Ligand binder design. Structure first.
Ligand SMILES: Nc1ccn([C@@H]2O[C@H](COP(=O)(O)O)[C@@H](O)[C@H]2O)c(=O)n1
Ligand SMILES: Nc1ccn([C@@H]2O[C@H](COP(=O)(O)O)[C@@H](O)[C@H]2O)c(=O)n1
Ligand SMILES: [Cu+2]
Ligand SMILES: [Cu+2]
Ligand SMILES: [Cu+2]
Ligand SMILES: [Cu+2]
Ligand SMILES: [Cu+2]
Ligand SMILES: [Cu+2]
Lengths: 212, 212
Protein backbone atom coordinates (compact mmCIF):
# COMPACT_ATOMS: atom_id res chain seq x y z
CA UNK A 1 0.00 0.00 0.00
CA UNK A 2 2.07 2.88 -1.43
CA UNK A 3 2.09 6.53 -0.32
CA UNK A 4 -0.39 5.46 2.34
CA UNK A 5 1.35 6.92 5.42
CA UNK A 6 1.38 10.52 6.62
CA UNK A 7 4.25 11.33 8.88
CA UNK A 8 3.78 13.75 11.73
CA UNK A 9 7.25 14.66 12.66
CA UNK A 10 7.74 16.45 16.01
CA UNK A 11 10.38 19.16 16.21
CA UNK A 12 8.55 21.96 18.04
CA UNK A 13 8.99 23.80 21.34
CA UNK A 14 21.68 27.44 23.54
CA UNK A 15 20.67 25.57 20.35
CA UNK A 16 17.34 23.60 20.40
CA UNK A 17 18.37 20.00 20.82
CA UNK A 18 16.83 18.62 17.62
CA UNK A 19 19.00 21.12 15.74
CA UNK A 20 22.34 20.47 17.35
CA UNK A 21 24.11 18.93 14.34
CA UNK A 22 25.22 15.32 14.24
CA UNK A 23 28.42 14.85 12.32
CA UNK A 24 27.15 17.46 9.81
CA UNK A 25 23.39 18.09 9.71
CA UNK A 26 20.73 19.04 12.29
CA UNK A 27 19.22 16.21 14.22
CA UNK A 28 15.70 16.50 12.87
CA UNK A 29 17.14 15.77 9.46
CA UNK A 30 18.26 12.25 9.86
CA UNK A 31 14.76 10.93 10.69
CA UNK A 32 13.26 13.37 8.16
CA UNK A 33 15.20 11.89 5.26
CA UNK A 34 14.58 8.31 6.38
CA UNK A 35 10.85 8.77 6.00
CA UNK A 36 11.27 10.74 2.70
CA UNK A 37 12.85 7.64 1.03
CA UNK A 38 10.20 5.11 2.01
CA UNK A 39 7.67 4.55 -0.81
CA UNK A 40 5.02 3.94 1.80
CA UNK A 41 5.29 7.62 2.88
CA UNK A 42 2.97 10.12 1.07
CA UNK A 43 3.64 13.34 2.92
CA UNK A 44 5.47 14.73 5.92
CA UNK A 45 3.85 17.15 8.36
CA UNK A 46 6.71 18.85 10.27
CA UNK A 47 5.94 20.33 13.69
CA UNK A 48 8.20 23.22 14.33
CA UNK A 49 8.66 26.87 15.31
CA UNK A 50 8.64 28.60 11.91
CA UNK A 51 12.05 30.08 12.68
CA UNK A 52 13.18 26.54 11.80
CA UNK A 53 10.84 26.11 8.80
CA UNK A 54 13.81 26.79 6.49
CA UNK A 55 15.75 23.81 7.80
CA UNK A 56 13.06 21.80 5.91
CA UNK A 57 11.75 23.52 2.69
CA UNK A 58 15.46 23.61 1.57
CA UNK A 59 15.10 19.99 0.46
CA UNK A 60 11.48 20.15 -0.67
CA UNK A 61 12.48 19.45 -4.26
CA UNK A 62 14.96 16.60 -3.67
CA UNK A 63 12.23 14.57 -2.02
CA UNK A 64 9.62 12.24 -3.36
CA UNK A 65 7.04 13.11 -0.68
CA UNK A 66 4.86 16.21 0.02
CA UNK A 67 6.14 18.59 2.73
CA UNK A 68 3.67 20.23 5.15
CA UNK A 69 3.72 22.42 8.17
CA UNK A 70 1.62 23.10 11.20
CA UNK A 71 2.35 24.94 14.36
CA UNK A 72 3.15 23.36 17.66
CA UNK A 73 1.08 23.63 20.80
CA UNK A 74 1.60 23.97 24.50
CA UNK A 75 2.16 20.31 25.29
CA UNK A 76 3.50 17.32 23.34
CA UNK A 77 -0.11 16.17 22.55
CA UNK A 78 -1.35 19.51 21.20
CA UNK A 79 1.33 19.54 18.48
CA UNK A 80 0.36 15.98 17.47
CA UNK A 81 -3.18 17.29 17.17
CA UNK A 82 -1.93 20.32 15.13
CA UNK A 83 -0.01 17.86 12.94
CA UNK A 84 -3.15 15.73 12.56
CA UNK A 85 -5.04 18.72 11.15
CA UNK A 86 -2.87 18.87 7.97
CA UNK A 87 -2.60 15.12 6.83
CA UNK A 88 -3.96 13.84 3.22
CA UNK A 89 -7.72 13.45 3.42
CA UNK A 90 -7.16 9.75 2.73
CA UNK A 91 -4.00 8.63 4.51
CA UNK A 92 -4.51 5.16 6.06
CA UNK A 93 -1.83 5.50 8.77
CA UNK A 94 -0.46 8.33 10.82
CA UNK A 95 3.14 7.91 11.75
CA UNK A 96 4.10 10.16 14.64
CA UNK A 97 7.83 10.61 15.16
CA UNK A 98 10.01 12.63 17.48
CA UNK A 99 12.85 14.62 15.87
CA UNK A 100 15.24 13.78 18.70
CA UNK A 101 15.39 10.23 17.54
CA UNK A 102 17.53 10.71 14.35
CA UNK A 103 18.81 7.16 14.32
CA UNK A 104 15.54 5.27 13.63
CA UNK A 105 16.39 2.40 11.18
CA UNK A 106 14.36 2.15 7.98
CA UNK A 107 13.82 -1.56 8.71
CA UNK A 108 12.26 -0.75 12.13
CA UNK A 109 10.00 1.96 10.68
CA UNK A 110 8.84 -0.63 8.03
CA UNK A 111 8.02 -3.13 10.80
CA UNK A 112 6.11 -0.70 12.86
CA UNK A 113 4.19 0.58 9.84
CA UNK A 114 3.17 -3.04 9.16
CA UNK A 115 2.22 -3.69 12.75
CA UNK A 116 0.22 -0.37 12.94
CA UNK A 117 -1.51 -1.40 9.74
CA UNK A 118 -2.42 -4.90 11.06
CA UNK A 119 -3.31 -3.80 14.59
CA UNK A 120 -4.51 -0.19 14.18
CA UNK A 121 -1.87 1.18 16.53
CA UNK A 122 1.71 0.22 17.16
CA UNK A 123 4.78 1.69 18.71
CA UNK A 124 8.41 0.58 18.54
CA UNK A 125 9.89 -0.64 21.85
CA UNK A 126 12.85 -2.47 23.35
CA UNK A 127 12.98 -4.62 26.47
CA UNK A 128 14.07 -2.23 29.31
CA UNK A 129 17.51 -3.34 30.50
CA UNK A 130 17.21 -1.64 33.91
CA UNK A 131 15.49 -3.20 36.91
CA UNK A 132 12.23 -1.37 37.07
CA UNK A 133 9.77 -1.60 39.94
CA UNK A 134 6.43 -0.02 40.74
CA UNK A 135 6.59 1.85 43.98
CA UNK A 136 3.56 2.91 45.99
CA UNK A 137 2.95 6.10 47.89
CA UNK A 138 4.87 4.79 50.87
CA UNK A 139 7.99 4.32 48.79
CA UNK A 140 7.71 0.55 48.98
CA UNK A 141 8.14 -1.82 46.07
CA UNK A 142 4.86 -3.35 44.87
CA UNK A 143 7.79 -8.07 31.08
CA UNK A 144 8.55 -4.38 30.71
CA UNK A 145 9.41 -2.55 27.51
CA UNK A 146 10.87 0.85 26.87
CA UNK A 147 8.76 2.84 24.41
CA UNK A 148 10.20 4.72 21.50
CA UNK A 149 8.88 6.41 18.37
CA UNK A 150 7.39 6.20 15.71
CA UNK A 151 3.91 5.57 16.98
CA UNK A 152 1.79 4.39 14.04
CA UNK A 153 -1.94 4.89 14.42
CA UNK A 154 -4.88 4.90 12.01
CA UNK A 155 -6.05 8.47 11.90
CA UNK A 156 -9.74 7.67 12.59
CA UNK A 157 -8.65 5.90 15.83
CA UNK A 158 -6.22 8.68 16.80
CA UNK A 159 -9.10 11.17 16.37
CA UNK A 160 -11.55 9.01 18.39
CA UNK A 161 -8.83 9.06 21.03
CA UNK A 162 -8.25 12.82 20.96
CA UNK A 163 -11.96 13.34 21.46
CA UNK A 164 -12.21 10.93 24.41
CA UNK A 165 -9.44 12.85 26.18
CA UNK A 166 -11.03 16.17 25.17
CA UNK A 167 -14.47 15.19 26.54
CA UNK A 168 -13.08 13.97 29.88
CA UNK A 169 -9.36 14.51 30.72
CA UNK A 170 -5.73 13.52 31.29
CA UNK A 171 -2.40 13.01 29.46
CA UNK A 172 0.43 11.56 31.56
CA UNK A 173 2.87 9.39 29.54
CA UNK A 174 0.99 5.12 29.80
CA UNK A 175 -0.81 7.85 28.20
CA UNK A 176 -0.81 7.51 24.65
CA UNK A 177 -4.12 9.10 23.77
CA UNK A 178 -4.70 5.49 22.55
CA UNK A 179 -4.02 3.79 25.88
CA UNK A 180 -7.43 5.11 27.06
CA UNK A 181 -9.24 3.61 24.04
CA UNK A 182 -9.92 -0.18 24.45
CA UNK A 183 -8.42 -0.65 21.03
CA UNK A 184 -5.15 -2.67 21.18
CA UNK A 185 -1.57 -1.25 20.97
CA UNK A 186 1.10 -3.50 19.50
CA UNK A 187 4.75 -3.02 20.44
CA UNK A 188 7.08 -3.72 17.52
CA UNK A 189 10.55 -4.69 18.66
CA UNK A 190 13.01 -2.01 17.76
CA UNK A 191 16.68 -1.34 18.24
CA UNK A 192 18.59 0.00 21.22
CA UNK A 193 20.24 2.51 18.85
CA UNK A 194 17.02 4.44 18.34
CA UNK A 195 18.17 6.48 21.29
CA UNK A 196 16.64 9.90 21.98
CA UNK A 197 19.05 12.89 21.89
CA UNK A 198 19.15 15.18 24.96
CA UNK A 199 22.58 15.30 26.67
CA UNK A 200 25.62 15.93 24.44
CA UNK A 201 26.70 12.60 25.88
CA UNK A 202 23.87 11.28 23.75
CA UNK A 203 25.35 13.11 20.75
CA UNK A 204 28.71 11.71 21.83
CA UNK A 205 26.73 8.48 21.63
CA UNK A 206 24.75 9.30 18.49
CA UNK A 207 28.14 9.88 16.79
CA UNK A 208 29.69 6.63 18.05
CA UNK A 209 26.69 4.87 16.46
CA UNK A 210 26.92 6.66 13.09
CA UNK A 211 30.58 5.52 12.98
CA UNK A 212 29.89 1.84 13.61
CA UNK B 1 25.21 3.11 65.14
CA UNK B 2 28.92 3.04 64.20
CA UNK B 3 30.81 0.33 62.31
CA UNK B 4 27.47 -1.44 62.03
CA UNK B 5 27.43 -2.07 58.26
CA UNK B 6 29.23 -4.77 56.30
CA UNK B 7 29.68 -3.96 52.68
CA UNK B 8 29.50 -6.69 50.09
CA UNK B 9 31.06 -5.15 47.11
CA UNK B 10 30.55 -6.96 43.76
CA UNK B 11 33.44 -6.97 41.30
CA UNK B 12 33.53 -10.62 40.17
CA UNK B 13 33.07 -12.46 36.89
CA UNK B 14 39.67 -6.69 26.77
CA UNK B 15 39.81 -5.25 30.32
CA UNK B 16 37.00 -6.26 32.78
CA UNK B 17 34.70 -3.29 32.89
CA UNK B 18 34.95 -2.54 36.62
CA UNK B 19 38.70 -2.15 36.07
CA UNK B 20 38.72 0.14 33.08
CA UNK B 21 40.15 3.25 34.78
CA UNK B 22 38.17 6.43 35.24
CA UNK B 23 40.31 9.51 34.96
CA UNK B 24 43.06 7.62 36.87
CA UNK B 25 41.97 4.62 38.96
CA UNK B 26 40.00 1.41 38.28
CA UNK B 27 36.27 1.69 38.49
CA UNK B 28 35.78 -0.56 41.49
CA UNK B 29 37.86 1.88 43.46
CA UNK B 30 35.66 4.87 43.50
CA UNK B 31 32.78 3.09 45.28
CA UNK B 32 35.33 1.15 47.39
CA UNK B 33 36.81 4.29 48.89
CA UNK B 34 33.41 5.91 49.41
CA UNK B 35 32.37 3.13 51.74
CA UNK B 36 35.84 3.06 53.45
CA UNK B 37 35.33 6.68 54.68
CA UNK B 38 31.88 6.23 56.21
CA UNK B 39 32.07 5.65 59.99
CA UNK B 40 29.02 3.47 59.72
CA UNK B 41 31.05 0.92 57.69
CA UNK B 42 32.86 -1.83 59.71
CA UNK B 43 34.30 -4.02 56.99
CA UNK B 44 34.29 -4.52 53.25
CA UNK B 45 33.86 -7.93 51.65
CA UNK B 46 35.13 -7.62 48.05
CA UNK B 47 33.84 -10.11 45.47
CA UNK B 48 36.43 -10.63 42.84
CA UNK B 49 38.58 -13.00 40.79
CA UNK B 50 41.76 -13.20 42.90
CA UNK B 51 43.77 -12.03 39.90
CA UNK B 52 42.31 -8.65 40.91
CA UNK B 53 42.77 -9.13 44.69
CA UNK B 54 45.84 -6.87 44.52
CA UNK B 55 43.83 -3.92 43.24
CA UNK B 56 42.41 -3.93 46.82
CA UNK B 57 44.92 -5.05 49.54
CA UNK B 58 47.20 -2.21 48.20
CA UNK B 59 45.19 0.24 50.29
CA UNK B 60 44.43 -2.06 53.22
CA UNK B 61 46.45 0.13 55.56
CA UNK B 62 45.18 3.56 54.48
CA UNK B 63 41.66 2.54 55.39
CA UNK B 64 39.73 2.65 58.60
CA UNK B 65 37.67 -0.48 57.82
CA UNK B 66 38.50 -4.24 57.68
CA UNK B 67 39.11 -5.70 54.19
CA UNK B 68 37.80 -9.19 53.32
CA UNK B 69 37.58 -11.46 50.36
CA UNK B 70 35.40 -14.22 49.10
CA UNK B 71 35.13 -15.84 45.74
CA UNK B 72 32.45 -15.17 43.22
CA UNK B 73 29.94 -17.69 41.96
CA UNK B 74 28.23 -18.61 38.75
CA UNK B 75 25.47 -16.02 38.86
CA UNK B 76 25.09 -12.56 40.41
CA UNK B 77 23.23 -14.08 43.45
CA UNK B 78 25.82 -16.77 44.24
CA UNK B 79 28.55 -14.15 44.75
CA UNK B 80 26.27 -12.18 47.09
CA UNK B 81 25.86 -15.42 49.01
CA UNK B 82 29.67 -15.98 48.97
CA UNK B 83 30.06 -12.39 50.21
CA UNK B 84 27.47 -13.05 52.94
CA UNK B 85 29.58 -15.94 54.26
CA UNK B 86 32.44 -13.63 55.38
CA UNK B 87 30.62 -10.64 57.15
CA UNK B 88 31.27 -9.71 61.06
CA UNK B 89 29.29 -12.11 63.22
CA UNK B 90 27.36 -9.09 64.47
CA UNK B 91 26.89 -6.66 61.59
CA UNK B 92 23.35 -5.16 61.69
CA UNK B 93 23.14 -4.30 57.97
CA UNK B 94 24.49 -5.80 54.81
CA UNK B 95 25.17 -3.29 52.12
CA UNK B 96 25.46 -4.93 48.72
CA UNK B 97 27.03 -2.79 46.02
CA UNK B 98 28.00 -3.27 42.40
CA UNK B 99 31.51 -2.16 41.41
CA UNK B 100 30.29 -0.75 38.10
CA UNK B 101 28.57 2.03 39.90
CA UNK B 102 31.66 4.10 40.95
CA UNK B 103 29.76 7.36 41.23
CA UNK B 104 27.47 6.53 44.21
CA UNK B 105 27.26 9.72 46.39
CA UNK B 106 28.10 9.38 50.08
CA UNK B 107 24.87 11.25 50.90
CA UNK B 108 22.78 8.66 48.98
CA UNK B 109 24.56 5.71 50.63
CA UNK B 110 23.82 7.38 54.05
CA UNK B 111 20.12 7.67 53.14
CA UNK B 112 19.80 4.15 52.00
CA UNK B 113 21.64 2.83 55.05
CA UNK B 114 19.09 4.71 57.19
CA UNK B 115 16.15 3.46 55.20
CA UNK B 116 17.50 -0.18 55.28
CA UNK B 117 17.92 0.21 59.02
CA UNK B 118 14.34 1.52 59.53
CA UNK B 119 12.67 -0.83 57.05
CA UNK B 120 14.90 -3.94 57.04
CA UNK B 121 15.59 -3.68 53.33
CA UNK B 122 16.08 -0.74 51.03
CA UNK B 123 17.49 -0.02 47.64
CA UNK B 124 18.35 3.28 45.97
CA UNK B 125 16.19 4.17 42.93
CA UNK B 126 15.29 7.01 40.59
CA UNK B 127 12.03 7.63 38.75
CA UNK B 128 12.50 6.00 35.28
CA UNK B 129 12.49 8.79 32.68
CA UNK B 130 11.55 6.48 29.77
CA UNK B 131 7.99 5.47 28.94
CA UNK B 132 7.79 1.94 30.20
CA UNK B 133 4.92 -0.43 29.51
CA UNK B 134 4.14 -4.01 30.41
CA UNK B 135 3.62 -6.07 27.31
CA UNK B 136 1.90 -9.45 27.26
CA UNK B 137 2.75 -12.51 25.25
CA UNK B 138 0.92 -11.17 22.24
CA UNK B 139 3.12 -8.10 22.14
CA UNK B 140 0.27 -5.86 23.23
CA UNK B 141 0.50 -3.16 25.87
CA UNK B 142 -1.24 -4.08 29.12
CA UNK B 143 4.77 5.00 39.26
CA UNK B 144 7.86 3.19 38.04
CA UNK B 145 11.36 3.48 39.45
CA UNK B 146 14.71 2.44 38.12
CA UNK B 147 16.63 0.36 40.65
CA UNK B 148 20.25 0.95 41.49
CA UNK B 149 22.69 -0.20 44.17
CA UNK B 150 23.47 -0.33 47.11
CA UNK B 151 20.82 -2.70 48.36
CA UNK B 152 20.82 -2.55 52.17
CA UNK B 153 19.38 -5.58 53.91
CA UNK B 154 19.54 -6.95 57.46
CA UNK B 155 21.60 -10.08 57.20
CA UNK B 156 19.08 -12.31 59.06
CA UNK B 157 16.42 -11.31 56.46
CA UNK B 158 18.82 -11.73 53.52
CA UNK B 159 19.57 -15.25 54.81
CA UNK B 160 15.87 -16.11 55.33
CA UNK B 161 15.50 -15.00 51.71
CA UNK B 162 18.40 -17.06 50.36
CA UNK B 163 16.91 -20.13 51.99
CA UNK B 164 13.42 -19.55 50.58
CA UNK B 165 14.88 -19.40 47.08
CA UNK B 166 17.10 -22.41 47.83
CA UNK B 167 14.17 -24.54 49.07
CA UNK B 168 11.96 -23.72 46.06
CA UNK B 169 13.41 -21.73 43.10
CA UNK B 170 13.92 -18.72 40.83
CA UNK B 171 16.04 -15.55 40.43
CA UNK B 172 15.00 -13.23 37.59
CA UNK B 173 15.71 -9.52 38.32
CA UNK B 174 11.80 -8.08 40.44
CA UNK B 175 13.86 -10.67 41.93
CA UNK B 176 15.70 -9.44 44.73
CA UNK B 177 15.92 -12.54 46.87
CA UNK B 178 13.89 -10.21 49.17
CA UNK B 179 11.04 -9.56 46.72
CA UNK B 180 9.84 -13.13 47.43
CA UNK B 181 9.80 -12.54 51.22
CA UNK B 182 6.64 -10.62 52.38
CA UNK B 183 8.94 -8.30 54.24
CA UNK B 184 8.83 -4.73 52.79
CA UNK B 185 11.45 -3.12 50.46
CA UNK B 186 11.88 0.63 50.66
CA UNK B 187 13.19 2.58 47.68
CA UNK B 188 15.40 5.49 48.74
CA UNK B 189 15.52 8.22 46.13
CA UNK B 190 18.94 8.41 44.61
CA UNK B 191 20.68 10.38 41.91
CA UNK B 192 20.68 9.97 38.16
CA UNK B 193 24.49 10.13 38.28
CA UNK B 194 24.77 6.77 40.00
CA UNK B 195 24.95 5.37 36.50
CA UNK B 196 26.28 1.86 35.89
CA UNK B 197 29.42 1.57 33.71
CA UNK B 198 29.26 -0.75 30.66
CA UNK B 199 29.80 1.07 27.33
CA UNK B 200 32.81 3.40 27.07
CA UNK B 201 30.12 5.94 26.29
CA UNK B 202 29.25 5.45 29.94
CA UNK B 203 32.90 6.13 30.84
CA UNK B 204 32.72 9.07 28.46
CA UNK B 205 29.75 9.90 30.68
CA UNK B 206 31.31 8.87 33.99
CA UNK B 207 34.14 11.33 33.15
CA UNK B 208 31.80 14.19 32.20
CA UNK B 209 30.25 13.72 35.67
CA UNK B 210 33.55 13.66 37.59
CA UNK B 211 34.37 16.99 35.86
CA UNK B 212 31.15 18.76 36.83
N1 LIG C 1 4.69 21.80 23.09
C1 LIG C 1 5.56 20.92 22.62
C2 LIG C 1 6.53 20.42 23.48
C3 LIG C 1 7.46 19.50 23.00
N2 LIG C 1 7.41 19.08 21.66
C4 LIG C 1 8.42 18.10 21.18
O1 LIG C 1 9.39 17.68 22.16
C5 LIG C 1 10.45 17.11 21.35
C6 LIG C 1 11.76 16.92 22.14
O2 LIG C 1 11.61 16.01 23.24
P1 LIG C 1 11.39 16.56 24.74
O3 LIG C 1 9.93 17.29 24.77
O4 LIG C 1 11.22 15.26 25.69
O5 LIG C 1 12.48 17.45 25.21
C7 LIG C 1 10.65 18.17 20.27
O6 LIG C 1 11.08 17.55 19.06
C8 LIG C 1 9.25 18.81 20.13
O7 LIG C 1 8.65 18.52 18.87
C9 LIG C 1 6.42 19.60 20.79
O8 LIG C 1 6.37 19.25 19.61
N3 LIG C 1 5.49 20.52 21.28
N1 LIG D 1 28.85 -14.63 38.63
C1 LIG D 1 28.88 -13.31 38.73
C2 LIG D 1 28.44 -12.54 37.66
C3 LIG D 1 28.47 -11.16 37.74
N2 LIG D 1 28.95 -10.53 38.90
C4 LIG D 1 28.97 -9.05 38.97
O1 LIG D 1 28.51 -8.38 37.77
C5 LIG D 1 29.04 -7.04 37.93
C6 LIG D 1 29.00 -6.22 36.62
O2 LIG D 1 27.66 -6.03 36.13
P1 LIG D 1 27.07 -6.99 34.96
O3 LIG D 1 26.95 -8.49 35.58
O4 LIG D 1 25.54 -6.51 34.71
O5 LIG D 1 27.88 -6.94 33.72
C7 LIG D 1 30.49 -7.29 38.33
O6 LIG D 1 30.94 -6.23 39.18
C8 LIG D 1 30.43 -8.63 39.08
O7 LIG D 1 30.71 -8.51 40.47
C9 LIG D 1 29.40 -11.31 40.00
O8 LIG D 1 29.82 -10.78 41.03
N3 LIG D 1 29.36 -12.71 39.91
CU1 LIG E 1 7.28 24.79 0.10
CU1 LIG F 1 -5.27 23.47 7.25
CU1 LIG G 1 19.92 10.53 27.28
CU1 LIG H 1 45.43 -8.26 53.76
CU1 LIG I 1 35.05 -18.13 56.02
CU1 LIG J 1 25.01 2.21 29.77
Amino acid sequence: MEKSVSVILLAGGSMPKQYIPLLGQPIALYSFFTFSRMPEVKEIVVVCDPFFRDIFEEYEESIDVDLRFAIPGKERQDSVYSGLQEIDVNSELVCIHDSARPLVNTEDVEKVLKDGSAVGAAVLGVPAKATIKEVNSDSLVVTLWEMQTPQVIKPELLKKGFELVKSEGLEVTDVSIVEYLKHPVYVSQGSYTNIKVTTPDDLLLAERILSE
